Design an enzyme around this catalytic site. Structure first.
Site, PDB file in Angstrom:
ATOM      1  N   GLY A 110       0.245  -1.239   6.469  1.00 54.57           N
ATOM      2  CA  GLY A 110      -0.338   0.136   6.543  1.00 54.57           C
ATOM      3  C   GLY A 110      -0.070   0.846   5.226  1.00 54.57           C
ATOM      4  O   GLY A 110      -0.771   1.764   4.883  1.00 54.57           O
ATOM      5  N   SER A 115       0.186  -0.903   2.440  1.00 53.62           N
ATOM      6  CA  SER A 115      -0.555  -1.870   1.551  1.00 53.62           C
ATOM      7  C   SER A 115      -1.549  -1.173   0.637  1.00 53.62           C
ATOM      8  O   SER A 115      -2.281  -0.338   1.135  1.00 53.62           O
ATOM      9  CB  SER A 115      -1.370  -2.837   2.390  1.00 53.62           C
ATOM     10  OG  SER A 115      -0.564  -3.007   3.543  1.00 53.62           O
ATOM     11  N   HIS A 155      -5.845  -7.520  -1.062  1.00 51.37           N
ATOM     12  CA  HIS A 155      -5.800  -7.991   0.360  1.00 51.37           C
ATOM     13  C   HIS A 155      -6.228  -6.867   1.318  1.00 51.37           C
ATOM     14  O   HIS A 155      -6.257  -7.043   2.525  1.00 51.37           O
ATOM     15  CB  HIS A 155      -4.364  -8.539   0.752  1.00 51.37           C
ATOM     16  CG  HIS A 155      -3.250  -7.524   0.869  1.00 51.37           C
ATOM     17  ND1 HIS A 155      -2.557  -7.005  -0.088  1.00 51.37           N
ATOM     18  CD2 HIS A 155      -2.732  -6.925   2.000  1.00 51.37           C
ATOM     19  CE1 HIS A 155      -1.694  -6.167   0.366  1.00 51.37           C
ATOM     20  NE2 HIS A 155      -1.774  -6.092   1.657  1.00 51.37           N
ATOM     21  N   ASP A 171      -2.862  -9.491  -6.819  1.00 47.21           N
ATOM     22  CA  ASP A 171      -3.318  -8.640  -5.665  1.00 47.21           C
ATOM     23  C   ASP A 171      -3.625  -7.200  -6.072  1.00 47.21           C
ATOM     24  O   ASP A 171      -2.838  -6.303  -5.834  1.00 47.21           O
ATOM     25  CB  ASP A 171      -2.200  -8.666  -4.568  1.00 47.21           C
ATOM     26  CG  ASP A 171      -2.583  -7.925  -3.260  1.00 47.21           C
ATOM     27  OD1 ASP A 171      -3.755  -7.666  -3.076  1.00 47.21           O
ATOM     28  OD2 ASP A 171      -1.650  -7.661  -2.514  1.00 47.21           O
TER      29      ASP A 171
END
Ligand SMILES: NC(=[NH2+])c1ccc2nc(C(=O)c3nc4ccc(C(N)=[NH2+])cc4[nH]3)[nH]c2c1
Ligand SMILES: [Ca+2]
Ligand SMILES: [Mg+2]
Ligand SMILES: [Zn+2]
Length: 223
Positions: A175, A177, A40, A84
């Site tokens: 942030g 992530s 993502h 992900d």
């Protein structure tokens, strides 16, 4: 990272900052030419910055290298965030030293209760916005899948695990992530999603890296 502490310059040497004119996601260096982050966090035009501590000051230990290719997992679902994970190849190999090092992929999955280290430059306020300039760290344990699933009914798959505290107060956040969750010296998770940040009974959800080692190895050896 909310409720964490300042890591210390270059004490998490495999932590990478993904930059597209500004820092927007973290990542982990797995070898001199490859980085694993979250799908993502995909963007076109990424520059990987290694050896960072303050992302607004060149302190001397950085290496800024552009990505040559990004590979989002074949089964990534942006609506549920299942699978992900994404791999980024560097245009030039990075020079590994004390400050820039790679992290090992796991040989098996980790057990609930294991304590991990999560790091990143994301938001530090649960109810507010404050982005730090230096790396923040958080030690958090892997939670049982039942407390994870009761918190997010019908949303957790076998490729995800929760880590954190149900009381709230400590969590990863926007942030952070794509960044690392390291337990017993192995990269076991990738910061993926959660409900807000540091809320009670809403722990953070992480990509379960032990389920993708074969895909990672096969993909970097063929690219
Ligand atoms: N390129 C973008 N526009 C972008 C990139 C990353 C994002 N991430 C979120 C997000 O909404 C988001 N990323 C999270 C990571 C951890 C937790 C957590 N509570 N542990 C919650 C998060 N929420 N929106 C995002 C938008
Ligand atoms: Ca810097
Ligand atoms: Mg991070
Ligand atoms: Zn995110």
């Amino acid at each position: 990272i909310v409720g964490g502490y300042t890591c210390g310059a270059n004490t998490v040497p495999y932590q990478v900052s993904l930059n597209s004119g500004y820092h927007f996601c973290g990542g982990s260096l797995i070898n001199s030419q490859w980085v694993v982050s979250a799908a993502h966090c995909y963007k076109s035009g990424i520059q990987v910055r290694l050896g960072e501590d303050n992302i607004n000051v060149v302190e001397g230990n950085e290496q800024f290298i552009s990505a040559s290719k990004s590979i989002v997992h074949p089964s990534y679902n942006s609506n549920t965030l299942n699978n992900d994970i994404m791999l980024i190849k560097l245009k030039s190999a990075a020079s590994l030293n004390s400050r820039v090092a790679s992290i090992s992929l796991p040989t098996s999955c980790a057990s609930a209760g294991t304590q991990c280290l999560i790091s990143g430059w994301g938001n530090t306020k649960s109810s507010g916005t404050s982005y730090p300039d230096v790396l923040k760290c958080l030690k958090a344990p892997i939670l049982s899948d039942s407390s994870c699933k009761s918190a997010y009914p019908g949303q957790i798959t076998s490729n995800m695990f929760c880590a954190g505290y149900l009381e709230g107060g400590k969590d990863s956040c926007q942030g952070d992530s794509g960044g690392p969750v390291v337990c017993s010296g192995k990269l076991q998770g990738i910061v993926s999603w959660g409900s807000g940040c540091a809320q009670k009974n809403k722990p953070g959800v992480y990509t379960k890296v032990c389920n993708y080692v074969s895909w990672i190895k096969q993909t970097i050896a063929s690219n």
